[PDB]
């Protein structure tokens, strides 16, 4: 299209072409109307832990030592209540009320009301955590080209395969910025966008690099939303599409004004809309470690 | 006092403890388990609720379109946002109230918003997201509208406009803009209160009630 | 579209259930005492 | 719905918790030996987990770690 | 060069007794480029405006320095006296359009180039030419964000 | 039971013009009152 415009075979050209350094020097573009750039498409796949530090109490120290300190205070007061083994029995009193399934609870005054209030607090905490977990199920790794995978695709045992479409600007960008990566990617070129998309869907290509607008459109149109872009804001050099015109043409002056009037009158948003488990296993392991620690403590005791 | 202690232990599960007494205990336990299950369900239902007001999806929200005295929002001054609002003749009713809350500078408007003087403030996405990143007490709402770009304003007689455009394109290609964005824009009690209160109350009571009982016995 | 635009708690049912269960418990206790 | 009573996915956790019960039971038996043969500890575990009124080193570990295991299991169930 | 006071783009700080400002460094340790800039002391109207010197630094000044280095330019940064971007506003004898602020200063011949977070607009383009946009963005809504509390 | 109660809590007095209140409000203890704007289609209907 650029060669067609240069050779006076056309006056204006609108073909979703992107603004490039070597394009603006031979032809004159107008004001861009849509934001685009270079993006990467990756496959899209309760994972966060519950009743732990990420779930709540990110400090994670004071809450989990509160039980220990109150148990120690209970042991101390039980020893002080003299006027079996106090250390090995008074702990059961506090640990028998933190949850409402403890049968061995021997509490022979107002201290009974106090421990009832503590049990009420514990069950309220359990209910609050359950409700938060009910509402904590609503839910990118490349994080831009600076990642080591892009710089060292062969570092891992399985090679990391990218994709690109020739006769375009993405190849120009990778050639002008990462010549070694461009040479590596030239061995995995695709003749069209559809072949790269279906290869990514079938897992042949780990990631695909192309224009941001087309990549976002294909991610939105993908069945099951199994392919997504690299987050949001991690895009490469951000440019626009514009319209290609011959240098010195007297039409660009009003074309830019018309495009700005369109974008300022809301004539673009409507067009854009019209056209485009692990936690349980970790808890079990932590409980096993706590059981081993308690067995060691009992042996010491 | 033992009967009421047992009743409280049944109500609050902490292990606190002829035919008529047995059947009364059966009925009391069956009632208490239903009550605690229903209370837990009600608490779980109550906790899942959006206490703060819903975030602004965009300009299509009727709350922004319909002005009100309880929710005041406006721009800073006659900037590009004012021109965009003026060009589209669809929101003059809120334009009337927007004209009454102008500010000398955008920073002053942001400071007023931080002081809750303004319910909302309309401005550029980049500045607002930078302020939200720097100041956690401010957040940005709305996806995208009136999308535009930042350009180097130059007079028509300047002969270096093409050179400026080529330099900007080369800087974008080399990643200089990305580096500048990373260096400048890309910056960084009830739950504890109740547990602290109950812990302190219990550790005080386990001694206070015991010494009181000892004094009463003596 | 533009011209024409726009928890739960222990209620009295719980109290009624408390009253009903208390009455049932009293009736059962009286029946057992008579029996 | 709710038909996934056993497990939605990765059903090996039901065997893993049983293995944990078995290992804590054999550890309690060993502690009792160093101071109630086969089914006492598992029955106590079921009682403390599924509340039914069931219930020197062995007694201490029974009073200490069974409570934590039961609280973890009920938290996971909730 | 004429610039507007915007914290994310043009940080403005007063000069010291020597006419300069403190030299700072970024997280990576690279030096922070700063220029000598002149602007009014008080932005509010009806105040004793004085063209005191300040140091203005940020994204806009870095872009200006890069452009000057590439094109062998010798820039002279200035601040808007009005303290506003400036558009077509109605004044006495309202049947008349006049540009004020930074745009008015540029159109009056006082300024030669504008480097500031100014969006591309149809009214701006009808009188001032703009190059390719170096940053693409939109408009959002700023609302006070209470800390999430249960 | 807890799940059923949690799901169930996610949740009109005249039910139309055929209610007895409109036909004869004097048969109810409260003085039911209904009005309409004159010089309109409602009164004609
Ligand atoms: C254009 O792309 C095709 C593959 O899509 C490639 O074979 C061809 O060599 C490219 N054109 C040039 C001039 O390299
Ligand atoms: C623009 O850049 C060219 C280099 O290609 C140079 O020859 C020319 O003098 C420059 N014009 C201005 C006005 O700086």
PDB file of C-alpha atoms in Angstrom, chain A residues 53 56 62 67 74 85 95-96 147-148 168 185 212 279:
ATOM      1  CA  UNK A  53      -1.628 -14.841  55.248  1.00  0.00           C
ATOM      2  CA  UNK A  56      -6.399 -12.222  55.704  1.00  0.00           C
ATOM      3  CA  UNK A  62       0.307 -11.407  65.963  1.00  0.00           C
ATOM      4  CA  UNK A  67      -3.516 -18.224  70.751  1.00  0.00           C
ATOM      5  CA  UNK A  74      -4.154 -19.615  80.976  1.00  0.00           C
ATOM      6  CA  UNK A  85       0.403 -31.323  84.853  1.00  0.00           C
ATOM      7  CA  UNK A  95      -7.743 -25.010  72.486  1.00  0.00           C
ATOM      8  CA  UNK A  96     -11.089 -26.615  73.367  1.00  0.00           C
ATOM      9  CA  UNK A 147      11.352 -10.833  30.717  1.00  0.00           C
ATOM     10  CA  UNK A 148      14.176 -13.363  30.462  1.00  0.00           C
ATOM     11  CA  UNK A 168       4.658  -5.786   8.407  1.00  0.00           C
ATOM     12  CA  UNK A 185      11.837 -15.454  15.420  1.00  0.00           C
ATOM     13  CA  UNK A 212      -2.252  -4.601  19.511  1.00  0.00           C
ATOM     14  CA  UNK A 279      -4.816 -24.371  49.480  1.00  0.00           C
TER      15      UNK A 279
END
